[PDB]
Structures are given as C-alpha cells and as structure tokens.
Amino acid sequence: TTIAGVVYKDGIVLGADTRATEGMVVADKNCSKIHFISPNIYCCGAGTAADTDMTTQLISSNLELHSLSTGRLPRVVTANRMLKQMLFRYQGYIGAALVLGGVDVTGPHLYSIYPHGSTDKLPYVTMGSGSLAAMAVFEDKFRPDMEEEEAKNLVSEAIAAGIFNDLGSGSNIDLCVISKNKLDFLRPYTVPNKKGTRLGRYRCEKGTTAVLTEKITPLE
Amino acid sequence: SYDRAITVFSPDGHLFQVEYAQEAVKKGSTAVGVRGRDIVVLGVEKKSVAKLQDERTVRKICALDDNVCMAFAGLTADARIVINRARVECQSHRLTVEDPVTVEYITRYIASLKQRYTQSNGRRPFGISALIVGFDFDGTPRLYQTDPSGTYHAWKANAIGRGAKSVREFLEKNYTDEAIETDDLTIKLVIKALLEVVQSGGKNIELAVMRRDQSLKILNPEEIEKYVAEIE
Amino acid sequence: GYDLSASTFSPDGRVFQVEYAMKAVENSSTAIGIRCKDGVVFGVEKLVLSKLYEEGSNKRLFNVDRHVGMAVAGLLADARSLADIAREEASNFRSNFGYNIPLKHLADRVAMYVHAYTLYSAVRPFGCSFMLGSYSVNDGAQLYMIDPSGVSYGYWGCAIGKARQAAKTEIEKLQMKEMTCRDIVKEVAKIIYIVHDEVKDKAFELELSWVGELTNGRHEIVPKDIREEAEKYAKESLK
Amino acid sequence: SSAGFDRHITIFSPEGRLYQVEYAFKAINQGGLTSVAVRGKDCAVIVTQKKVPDKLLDSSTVTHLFKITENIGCVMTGMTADSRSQVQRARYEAANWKYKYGYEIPVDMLCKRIADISQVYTQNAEMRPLGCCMILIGIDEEQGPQVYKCDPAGYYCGFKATAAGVKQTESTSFLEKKVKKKFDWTFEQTVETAITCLSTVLSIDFKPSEIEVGVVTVENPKFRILTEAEIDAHLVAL
Amino acid sequence: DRGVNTFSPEGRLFQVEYAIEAIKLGSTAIGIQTSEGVCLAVEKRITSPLMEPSSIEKIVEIDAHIGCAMSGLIADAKTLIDKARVETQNHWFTYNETMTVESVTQAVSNLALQFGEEDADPGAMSRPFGVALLFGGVDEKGPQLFHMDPSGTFVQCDARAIGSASEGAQSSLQEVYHKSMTLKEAIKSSLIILKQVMEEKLNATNIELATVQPGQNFHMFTKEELEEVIKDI
Amino acid sequence: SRRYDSRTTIFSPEGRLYQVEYAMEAIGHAGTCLGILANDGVLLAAERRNIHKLLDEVFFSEKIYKLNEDMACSVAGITSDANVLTNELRLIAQRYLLQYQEPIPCEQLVTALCDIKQAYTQFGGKRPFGVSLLYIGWDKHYGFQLYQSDPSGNYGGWKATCIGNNSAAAVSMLKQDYKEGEMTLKSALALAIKVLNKTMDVSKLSAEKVEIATLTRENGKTVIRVLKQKEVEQLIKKHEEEEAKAE
Amino acid sequence: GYSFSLTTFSPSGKLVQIEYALAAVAGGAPSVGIKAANGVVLATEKKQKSILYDERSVHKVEPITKHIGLVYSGMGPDYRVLVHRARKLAQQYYLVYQEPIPTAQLVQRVASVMQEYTQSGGVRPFGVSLLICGWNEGRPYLFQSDPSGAYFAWKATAMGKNYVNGKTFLEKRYNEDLELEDAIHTAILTLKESFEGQMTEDNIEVGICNEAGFRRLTPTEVKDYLAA
Amino acid sequence: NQYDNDVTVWSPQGRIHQIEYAMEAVKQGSATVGLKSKTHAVLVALKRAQSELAAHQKKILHVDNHIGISIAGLTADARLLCNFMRQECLDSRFVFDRPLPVSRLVSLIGSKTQIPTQRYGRRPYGVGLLIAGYDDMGPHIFQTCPSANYFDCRAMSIGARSQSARTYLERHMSEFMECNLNELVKHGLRALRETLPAEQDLTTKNVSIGIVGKDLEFTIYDDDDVSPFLEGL
C-alpha cells in the first residue's frame, strides 16, 4: 500500500494504489484506498483496510451533523483533531494510517495521521508500505505553488515509483483533485501494466464434469 | 427505577392494597380441592365457553412439576408470572437436593413472593390465591393454601373464589373418613361442592385427579359426566 | 399551590421557596463585617440562649482557608453544610493549580452549588447567608457575599441579621477606606452594640477576626487584649 | 384555563400553551432592567443599564457584561441566580467546540447549543425553565457581526436590533422606527445609537457610571469593555 | 397523601403508630422468665376444623438454645426468622461461641425502621414491621426474654403479654409472677390467663408450648404432653 | 413527589385497576377487527377508519403488520401503542428462531408478550397498553390458531371472535353462524362480511375500507398473502348475490 | 426524574394529553406539502413580527439527509429535538447499511421516539406534527407524523391554522400527472388561501425533493414562482 | 395543611416545620443529664419503668474508651448514629491512630444529620444525644440536637420535665468546677430527682450512670455498682 499527496496552488491532490494484499498473496486489485469524507474534503488510508474503512465512516457521519447543523463547509483541521482524538483513546490498537486533505475557507491543507494519534502538517506526505520510495520522489522535484497538471505528473510519478519498487502496491493508479470550486476524481487514472492475452483455450466442453444429484427450483 | 410507597399502614393496622387484593380473587372462579388418602381431587369452574373457545388455553389447573400441580382462582394474569417462576424453583430443589419438592417447599417460595410484593416499593400485591396439591416421597397427600397476604395454611378441604365460605360450609358437613377412602366418593365430594354454586346445570368445570401411580391425567368431559348420573 | 414546589414560578414569575428560605436570615442574629485597606474585619453577635453553654459554643466564625474566613448567618444547620463544601474547592483548586484560591474564584464555585439546589424541587434551597473575605498581594482586600439564591455581589460593607436595612444606616457613613485593620475593631463592635435588642434578646458574645498585613494574610481570631478595648471604647459611647 | 396539574408543572394545557413557559416570560421582569443591542457593519455594540442602588456595592464586580470567549461576549437580563448558571454552561459549550471540533465556535453554534439545554427544561417537570435571556455578539469570518438571543422558550432566532427586559416591548417602537434609514443606523457610531434607545424610553440619560458597553469590531475582534471616561466620549456627542 | 417518613406533632412517625395498631389484632402470646427457664405459649386461633394445626407454628427454633415467638401479622415474621437464623450463624462465623441472647434481639432490631420511597434501594420495605416478636434463650448469664417494638425498641421482660389480650393481662401477670416460681409453676399459671382471654375452649389442640432449659435445648410439647397440663387445670 | 403522582398501580376499593378499565374503552371506540379459525386456514378482517382519498399506502398493508414468516397480527386501538407491540413481537419471534430454529408456536409467542404487557399494569407507575389485538398463525402441533390479547395481559384461544368497536354484538352473531369442524377457507371468507355489514353504518363496502389476509400452508410451507382489492371486491359481489336470493 | 407517567388514560379512555397536543399544532406555522410524479414540493409560512428579526439564520425547512428533509407545524424547540434525533437515527442507518435510508424507514423510527415521551414519565409529549419527504427507489415519499407517533402517508395535506379548510382547496384541485414544476404552483396557492397579510419571498421557504435530491430555493428563485 | 406532610417545604415564617416536629419527639421521652468537672465528666441517665416485671430501659451505650454517650427518644436512630461513631472512632485509630478529639466528633455527626434534612423523602434524625468525652484539653459535654445544629454545654438535661432539671443546673453550676468523685454524682442524682414525679423516688434499679475522665475510662454502672454513689441522699 502506497498513498501520497501534495499541495498545489489552488488546491491539493491525493493518490493511492488499487492493490490490497492479504499476507503475501494479492486479494483485491479494484480496492479504493481513497475515501469520501465531505464534498470539499477527502481522505486516504493505509495499514489495516477494515480499520480505516469503519473509522472513515465514523468521522464522516460526525461531519454530516456538522455541515448540516452549521450550514457551512467543514474544515480540514476540524476532522484532523477528531482522528487523533479517537486514536489516542485506543492507545495504538487501531493500526489505521490516514492522510487527510482538502480545501476549506482558509485554504489547502494536508495532514499525516499516524495510528498512535501523531498528526503533522505538511505540503506533502507519504504513508503506507511504499511511503519510502514515494517520499524520495517528492524530496526531488517538489516546487512550491505548482500548477494542476504539474502536480498530477509529480504524484503519479511518485506512486508509480513505489509500485515499481514496493511489493504491496500496483495494478492501477488512483488520483483525486480538489480545487476551491471544481472537483476532479479519476479512479482509473493510469494503468501501468495490463494482463497478457491467453494463448491456449482452457474452456471445457459441456458434460465433462460428473454430477451426482441435480435440483432445480423455479422462481417468479 | 420506580420507587414509591404503594402498600402502607392505615388506622387499626389495616393494609389497603392487601385487603383490596383479596377483593379481586373473591370475585373470580370457584376452585375446590380435597385431601384424600391415596388420591387428591381438584377442580375449577369455567365462566363460559359458547363453542368459540379453545379449552386448552382457558385451563386454570396447571402442573408445576411431576409431583406438585397447582391451580389458581381470581385474576389470571398474576398467576402466569408465579407459575413461570415456581416451575424454575421446582428444578432448583431437584438440582441441589436431588429429590422432588414437597407441597410445603413449593408453597413457602410462592408465599415468600406474595410477601415481598405486599411490602417492597413500587410492586403491587398479588390478587391471586392458589391451592397446591402434591405427594411427598412417601405418597402422603398434602394441601397448602396460599394467601395474597403472604401466609399459608393447610386444609383437608377448602374453597377459593366466589362462594368460598358457602362451599366451606358444605365441605365441613359432608367430609368423612369414608369419603377419602373411596376414590369415587372422594371425587363425588368435590363435584357436589362445585354443583352447589352452579345453578345452570351441565358441566361448567374441568376436573383433574392426581394419583400416585400414573400421577395426573385431566379427566375427559365424558368421564366427568360418568360420575354425574350416579350422584344425580 | 404554587408555594409547595421547589420548581414553580408564580404568575408573577417569582420563586417562593427561595424567598421563604431568604427569611431564615432575617430571623437570625446580626453578623457584620467591614472591608478596610489592609484587609477585611469579621464580626458576629452570638445570641446566648442559656448560661449553661460553654464559652465559645455555637461558633458562627468558620475558617475556610489560610486567606479565607467565613461568617455564617441564618440557620447554622445549612451553614455547616456549605462549610465542608467550601473546603472541597479549597483543597481542589490547590491540588490542581497550586495556588491559594482567590476570593473571586471561590465566590463563583459556591454560587453554583447554592443555585443548583434552587433549580430542583427534590431538595430544599439553602436559606443561609455567609460572608467570605480574603487579602492578598494582587487582589488586596476582598469581601463577597453568597445569597440564599446563589447571587454574588461585591461589598465594601456588610449588614446582616434581624436588623438589615437598619444596620446599614450607620454603615452608610463610615469612610473606613481611609483607615487600617486594627482601627476597624472599634468601629465594628460600635455598630454591633447599638443594633442589639435589649427587650427580646438578653446577652450576647462578641467574636472578632480579621486578615491583614499584621497577620501576614492569615485568618485568626482577634486576641482578648484588643477585644477588651471594644467595651473600653464602644460601650462607653453608649452612655 | 388550568385543569389539574397544568399550572403546577410542565404539561400540555387544554390550549397547549405550556403555562410554565409563559410564567418564565415574566421572570425577566423581576430585575426591572432593560438591555438593548444593535449590530453594525464592521462593529457590534451592547448598551445596557447597570443599577447601583447601594453605595457599598463594588462597581467592578457587579456587571451584566461577562467575557464568554475571546471573540464573543454576553449580556443577560433576569434573575442573577439564573444568569450566572448560563455563564459556566456557555463556557462548557464553547470549550467543547475548541477541543473536540478544534477551532473558534461561531455565535450561531454557540447560541444553538444553549437552546438545546433550555429545551430540556420545558419537557421536564423536575427542573424549571430559567428566566434569563442571553444576548451575544461576535465577529464571523463570513457573516461578520452575529447577534443571537436565547429565550426561556428555547428560540435561538437571530435579531438585528435587540431588546430585552421590562421595556423590551416599548423599546422596539424606537427600533422598528429605524427600518426607514439605512440598516437601522449602521455606522461606526452605532455605539451612540444603542445609547439613545435606553435614554429615549426611560427619559433618564444615564451618566457615565450607569452605562456599560461591550464592543467587538473587525479591527478589534476581541470583546472589550469601555471605561467610564470612554463612555463620556459618546455621551458628550449628544 | 403522606410520605414514608412523617412525624406528627408528637413525632411518632405515623406509620409505626399504625403498625402497632396491627399487633392488637393478632394472637395472644405470653412468655415468662424464671430461674429454671423460659416458657412460651401462643394461641393458634384456628378458624375452621378442616385446618391442620400441625402446619401452623408461631414458635420456631432459631438457635439450639434460642427460640422464637411471634404475634400479629405472620407475613413479615417469616422474613426476620430467616434473618435471625443468619445472625445467629453470623456469630458462629467469627467468635465460635453460642450467640448471646442479648445480641440476638439487638441485631434483629437494627433492621427495624429501615425504609424509604426515594433512592433508598432498588427494593426494600415500603412499610415498617407490624409484627411483635418475643425472643428467649439460655446463655451463660441465664434465661432471658425480650420484646421487639415496631419502632425498634428492644427491652428485657420477665413476663410480657402481647396480642389482642395484652390489655388487662399485664396486670394479671404482676400478681401471679414471683421469683421463686419453677418452670412447671409458670406453665400452669400462664395457661390459666390464656384460658380466660380465649373466646373458644382451650385444649391441647390449638395451644403451642415450648421450653428452654440450661441442660435441655429448644424443645416443644406434643399433643400428649400438652394435655397433661390441661388435665391439671 | 407523591403530590403529582396519579397512582396508576393502586387497587380500587372493588379490586380493579382504573387504568385497565379505561383501556377497554379505548379499543371500544377503535376500528373493528374479527377473525375465524377454520380447517383449511385462518383469516382476519379490519374496518379502516380513514376514508380520505389522498391517503396513500406505501408498503402493501396498513394494520396487518406481519409478525414473522409463520404468522401476522391484527391490531385495534391506538396505532402508536400498536406499533411498539409489533416491534416487540418481531424481536421475540426472532428470538425464538435464535433459541430454537423452528417455527414459533402461536401459544408460546403470545405468552412472552402478555407477560411483558402485565409489567406496566404491575410496576413502573406507567400507563398500560391500550391495544387489544389478535393473532393468526400456524404451528407444528395444534395447527392454525387464533388468540385474543386484552390490555391486561389475559389471553385465550378463540375459534371465532371480534375486537374493536361493536365486538359485543359481533361475537353474539358469530355463535349462531359458526360450525365446529365444517369451516373451510372459502366459506369462512364469505361469512366474515355478514358481520362487517351490520357493524359498519353503510350497507355495502367498497373493499377499500376493509382488508382481508389469508394464511394457509402450501407445498410444506405457510404462505401469507393479503387478498388484492380485486380479489376482495369479487368476493364481496359473491356475498351480494346471496343477499338478493335470501330476500 | 419522576418514573411515573405524566400521561394517563381518561375514564373516556382517549388519552387526554396528546388530545390537547393537537391544539398546539393548530396554532403553529402552517406547512403544506404536495406529492407529484417526479418529486415532492414543500412550502411553509415563515412569519416574522418585525424587520428586526433576521431571516438568514432560522429555517423552518432544514435538510435532514441528502435525499430527506423535514418541515414542521408546531413548537420551535420541540422541533429542534427531532432534527438532532432524525439526523442521528439516519446515521444509525448510514454507519450500518452504507446506503440511503428510505423515508418509510426513517419515519417509523421517529414514530417510536414520539411514543417514548408520551408513555414514560418525567417527560412531556412533543407538540410538533412532522412532515417528512424523501426520494428513494424512484418513488416520491410524503408523510406526516402526529404527536402520538402514528405515521400517516399523504399526498397533499395541510397543517397549521385552518388545516381542515386547507384540505378543501387540495381536494378541489389535485392531479397525479403533475410534475415538479406544476406542483410548486399549487403549493403556493394553498398557502395563498388565507395568509392574513401579504406574502413575499421572505415570508415563505420552499424546498423540493426529487432525483436531484433535497434542497431549498433561494428567495430570488422563489420570486419567479411568485409572479402568479 | 400541605406544609406539615413534606420535609423540604419552608414555612412562611422561614423555618423548617419538620425540624419543629423532629424536636418534639426528643422533648418527650426519658430524662437524662450530664456534667463536667475539672478532671472528670459524669452523666446520669434515668431508665423509664414501663412495668415492675420488665427491665426499665437501656439509656447508655459505650462508644470508645474515652468517649461515651447517652441516648433519648427513639432507640432506632440512636443505635444508628451510634454505629456511625462506632466506625468513626475506629477510623480514628485507622487514619489518625490516636484518640479522637471530641471536638471533631461533633462535626462528623453534624454532617450526617444535615443530609436527610436537605433532601426529599428523608426524615431528620429524631434522636437527641448527650456525649461525654475526654482529651488533652479536658473533659467535654456535647449536646446533639435532632436538627443538624450542634451544641456545646456545661450541663443540660434531655427528657420530660427538663425545665426543672435545668433550673437545678442554674444554681450549683459554679460549684461544678471543684468536685471529687463523690460530689460529682452527688449533684447528678439530685438533679435527676427534680424530673421524678412526686409519687416516685430515685432508686438503684432505675438509675444508670456512666463516668469518664482522665485516669477513669468510660464504664457503665448497673444497680449494683451505684450503691456507694447513692449514699449521699
């Protein structure tokens, strides 16, 4: 798992892999590591997927009461102090590693939320098993106040750098773009490699399988 | 939790909720039973049927366990809670003692429950009165009446519900040692006491006799009428 | 039946149980205090019911903390109730922040506890009224009152007892803010003796205490040497 | 009419008027005071009467203007016992916002949680509705000046020119007359407008000692009380 | 109309004033304290002949050397007798000695007047005990006899008459009682007073006797030995 | 505070409960519902008290409130109190499925409820339930069953009975027209309207004011299907033809 | 807290307390919804006795969820209790099933909360009659929840003052073939019956629920509908 | 009408009617008295005679070695409040691990009596108490009102006809400073004789006298041990 994000001029960018592996064997190539918090703010995830999943919806419904009662847009730092407050209660049992980003009335903000509750504020952060190789790319070509297309080229270069290196990431690249007004989310942004075409034919003819009993129940 | 004073003392020392609880069971059905020799006979009166009712759910006579079988009169609701509780305690003595309950040990628990709800806060007293029959390890017949005040007494014969004092007058006169010796006369004594209150004729009662061997089996209405033509 | 409840407000929007409890002070003996430059002087006129009482009994002067004393009026039953309650926030505030509690702070804590009992009908509202005072470098002389409803006001002077509006008449003209602690003692007892009732009431005991620079901010009872100067001055002014 | 326990506790009247809520409306009249506030464009002002009947009173410790948060003050009219109760509460409500939710609470969300506590009184006979009315002012990053009021009935409905106390009825006639001129006298001099209200209906013209004024501005977002000398600066203008 | 705790202008506690009035409607019981032992005789007041008298015992065994006697409402009595049986064993729980009769009634009287309708206990008495109790036993200090007040007042009584016949019987006990009376002399003298106040005919059926001696534990007299005293009267 | 307590759990000087007495007056003014026990199955009926046209029905039924796969109910009384009773039965009937994994017998389900219905008539100082309802269902042993639960918690088996308004005269007319053992699924449907015509003020029913649900077993499984308005209207016309021939 | 019920049965046996609860809704702000083919239109009367009041804060029509919103007739603070409850009962659905909640489901949960305060003591019933609307399964939903907690499915109903006379005009002119645009017109005409004054863009708050979800109309957009 | 039946209702005069009804129960009952001298403090308790056969009463309980108490009015809350002091004095040897000063004991009892007065459904303790104790400051005599108010007296009498007993205390009070062991009880006996009816007399049977002092621990004296102390009559 490799997740990363940067802060450009008019907004931020989030990115994640699609690869979810159980142990040493790949499980889901369609998995979405990027989740929806609020219309203006989304969040990434790594570590334990199920822990990040439920934790995402626990804080998401809390911001639903916020945005509906306040009638205004939620803030990045708002949800940031909820995560470290809930993770501090569990003293590190939850292995959820989250990356929160969005654009509020203040501006673009990007945070890095550790399982123990440690939160930092950075223009760019990398989490997951490939956070190392992904950080090396941001330590190089990162420039302050870049453009929109310049960020999508830098991020996707960092995720693919980890995909080609880390074993726990790949099969597709997912990105998200959040500006002050427009919003762009492309699940299938870039596919680094595709499955090869099968040469032979493994299809078996009908009747080659021995069937003992058979039952058919009609329905409406 | 609801905490209030329900049953409180009054002038002369009377308890209203305890006295008013008796007014409910005195207006119910008439239940009569007699302690015999080798057999105990107990029966209750049914208000009406009119062919539209299931005779199984209207049964007042129930079975707490194999040996002990209890019936009730008056308000039916409260009795449902006691029967559900007592049947659990029938196993509790069988649990520890590894012997079946007596008529007294099941009555003390039922008497202890009625005591607690005539005293403790927030609970209304039971408006029910029951007649408990059963045999001991030696097969000795025993009858212990339960009172809504929480006490209990023993009786050879007695009645509860409407006309409980009128039936008791009929039981004191006709009770003899020859009636408890003959199973027929023992059954016939209870039927004659129940027919005194009923002026409508026919069979309004559900009669069940509980012996030793092959314990209790509720008598069919044809078997009940079999003894009606003899006493008629 | 508006009176019976704690809860109710009468068609005029008035809480009777607090007003019925407020009359507990008007039926109680006079206890007054004066706020001077270097501190605040406390005093109590203690009604003597019988001579069999040991000298110093039914003490109406409570010591809340090193810098804070207490002079209680009304029913002594509820007075001792808030006594130990005042010792709670006293031991609390210092267990957390580590300071001698400022009188403004403590005046807020005990005001909420008194008002907490006026909201509910399940408890009787406190009708007693007690006086608190403190002297410190930053705050200086501080004298506050706790009403039976939980209202806290700042006061340069205090008139409490069977005679309240009549006791402040002589308190109206003082100019004690030009005077220091040890000179207030003569003014305190002078007001206490003139407001005493010689018809219904018979004998009383004078108990005085103050906090100042001579005491280094400590609450202690006035010694008998200065105490006897009262009768040597105020009693002579009675003629 | 009153049938049974209608008048004694909180239950539906035959007209469903909730008599206990109506009895709380007259609880503010026990103080016999009046409080008015009017919000401007870049500023907000609160002008209310501070009555000192006894010369032994300490004018610094007796006030209706308390500091709630950095950007929000308050003024309350009613029983002082009921007044001081909301003080710690509104502080508990605002500090829970700054810790859990993690930033400065608006006047809208600060006055909305107060009505959530006050509505508990109307539905419970164990606890009485408080007869205090809160009036808060604050500067918002978007809506600017925010003036919201919480009554005993539990209405958080926001106002523009605010009135409270015994004169809350007749004092609106002075404020409702302002619907002609722009934005109900919205200036930097709005401090003078609220002072005219109290002096108009009561026909007093308080001295500098009898007036207490909290002010929040865009230049000074913090709640601040003006000294009696600074009050005379506006009083000499008239 | 009133709470569980209310004092009148006397400040009795109403509920107890009404609880004592319930004892005056109960059966008559008279104990006697002599140098040899303590005898207890209680009238069963059998209503109808079909009732089995052997099932009703108002004199029950508490400890080996300590018995019990009850009067008035039996419903509340069946509790304390189960409580006192624990308290006697609670003394065996620590001191490994026969519990003194003084501490028995002393400990049982503690539960008296424990009640309330507000936040007192998820369950507990809504009314005080309307039962009068006479406890007796032989300890190292000799035989003793105690009485319990619904208000919790315990007092040592040489001869005490309780029940519906309590009025006028206490005056008769002062004349017949002496300090030289033996156990058998107190027995016969007790039934004579009981025979007068009883509306029915006193016999070995409806009467219940029990004796406690320093050399003999708690024991009851069956219908045989009961008739022996009846024949002598 | 005892001053404001209405004392719902106190006994009357005659030994009754004032809240339970007035609970029967509630259902007395509510809608009329009846049921019939037959050999082929069991049915019900209901008189809808809402004749307004703009009223819709979202999820097939109104007062039916299907209890489980093996049975449903019919309620007459306050709809509110009737809503919680269905919420409680659906839990207990599924608590049967947990603890048992069989179809729940109708006798066991009504037990666990009427025992809970009695608690409010006993302790808690709360008003009792004002809903007297019915049950249609089927079990392994005694087969199809019909029960009537009073607000006090005293229930009993009924072959034919009625609840709600005009239940007195209803049940009196059911004694004459009922036959033991000869009741089928069809003939029992045609007899139900005869009582519904005399109870309701109007002469004929539009089949909108009434709803009839059938409960039977087919292919080793019980099937609960509410009769469609067309199936009801066609069955009402069959009763209309019998009224013309009888006169 | 008093455990005993503050509401008991009459000798008549109609509950008294909720019977007087209808007198509170009869004096509240009227709200008239209409169920159309493609959606639902909601318009209520927001009255302010003086210009001093601020109408940019209080909303009688507030969003419950994305696809569900609520309008009321009755007491203000009693309605505030339901808003926080109705939104939290939906989070019990959202945190679990991860889908939109049906209106038939959300109203039945509110129906249980209505009763808890009618029966249990120490708490009074609600004096608010809710009207909840949502869009699910491609079908419009319009419901009304009485203070007693009995949910009634309606198409076009009337609350507030003269709710009996409000059904008159609704029963007169009402078509199921109408669409979202046509239903907005008749929604204003019902409130236009007797306004006891002059309605403006600030005297009415309109909202709609359809495939696009639930939202409210700005006072400028309502002015276009106020031309008739 | 509706004032007297509730504990927390404030009278229109500003007092607690329930306290007024709580004190009347203490004012009506058995009479007790106590005194204090320089190095010693002695109390005398009268045991009211209900009948010649039964023992009169028990008016005195042993709290600790240096502290003892006499009770009045109801016995129930008497032993209740006694059980408090039983545990509190043991807590003094637990926490402080020294003799508990009597000045602190009156403060703990006052905190226990004020709780039921301020809450609904709780009656005030209707038991007046008289405490005798000794510490490094000398002996003390403390009176416990049924109200939460705490008293400190040189002498006092709680019971019927306490006015005549206090009148005797207004005379010899000055002489109570210097007394020996014989003169202590000498004033106490004749003080109790003022409360006795004109047709009765003070004997050894009806008197119970506790004595606590510097070198004398608190000990209860029965009819046998009071023989040398009554020779001065």
Numbering used by the authors:
A (entry chain B): 1 to 220
B (entry chain Y): 2 to 233
C (entry chain b): 6 to 244
D (entry chain V): 6 to 243
E (entry chain Z): 9 to 241
F (entry chain X): 2 to 248
G (entry chain W): 4 to 231
H (entry chain a): 4 to 236
From the paper:
In order to better understand how a ubiquitin conjugate enters the proteolytic chamber of the 20S complex, we performed cryo-EM single-particle analysis on purified human 20S proteasomes before and after incubation with MonoUb-Cyclin B1-NT. A similar analysis of substrate-incubated 20S complexes resulted in five classes, with one class (S1) comprising 29.1% of the particles in an asymmetric appearance. Incubating with a ubiquitinated substrate for a mere 5 min resulted in asymmetric structural alterations to the 20S barrel by destabilizing subunits in the cis α-ring of S1 relative to S2 and the proteolytic chamber. Discontinuous density in the cis α-ring was particularly notable at the N-termini of α2/α3/α4 subunits that define the gate at the center of the ring. Discontinuous density could reflect potential conformational dynamic variations in the gate region of the affected maps over an area of sufficient dimensions to enable entry of the branched polypeptide at the site of ubiquitin conjugation to Cyclin B1-NT. Careful observation of the models reveals variations in the gate region and in particular to the reverse turn of several α-subunits (located between the N-terminal tail and H0 helix). We note that the reverse turns are key factors in 20S proteasome gate opening. Comparing density maps of 20S complexes with and without substrate also highlighted the flexibility at beta annulus loops in both β-rings. Indeed, we observed binding of a ubiquitinated substrate induced discontinuous density and conformational dynamics in the center of the 20S α-ring of sufficient dimensions to potentially enable simultaneous entry of a few polypeptides.
The proteasome, the primary protease for ubiquitin-dependent proteolysis in eukaryotes, is usually found as a mixture of 30S, 26S, and 20S complexes. The 26S proteasome holoenzyme consists of a 19S regulatory particle (RP; a.k.a. proteasome activator 700), which is responsible for recognizing the ubiquitin signal and unfolding the target protein, and a 20S core particle (CP), which hydrolyzes the unfolded polypeptide into short peptides of varying lengths. Three of the seven β subunits in each of the two β-rings that align this proteolytic chamber (β1, β2, and β5) are proteolytically active, and between them hydrolyze most substrate peptide bonds to generate a variety of short peptide products. We show that 20S proteasomes can degrade the ubiquitin tag along with the conjugated substrate.
